[PDB]
């Protein structure tokens, strides 16, 4: 789940 | 949809 959150954060930054 | 994207970004910041 940490992987999934960081991917969304990186897509939107 | 801009508002929705900003709500996700702000939740994860």
From Swiss-Prot, chains A, B:
Cite the effect that the entry attributes to residue 2 to Q: Loss of antimicrobial activity against M.luteus
Q: What is the effect of changing residue 8 to Q?
A: Loss of antimicrobial activity against M.luteus
Q: What is the effect of changing residue 8 to A?
A: Loss of antimicrobial activity against M.luteus
Q: What is the effect of changing residue 7 to A?
A: Impacts oligomerization. Loss of antimicrobial activity
| Region described as Active core: spans on this chain | 1-13
Query: What does the UniProt record say this protein does?
Result: Acts synergistically with peptides KS-30 and KR-31, killing bacteria such as S.aureus, E.coli and C.albicans at lower concentrations when present together, and maintains activity at increased salt condition. Does not have the ability to stimulate CXCL8/IL8 release from keratinocytes.
Kindly provide the name given to this protein in its UniProt entry.
Answer: Antibacterial peptide KR-20
- Tell me what organism the protein belongs to: Homo sapiens
What is the gene name? Answer: CAMP
């Amino acid at each position: 789940f940490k992987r999934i959150v960081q991917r969304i954060k990186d897509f939107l930054r």
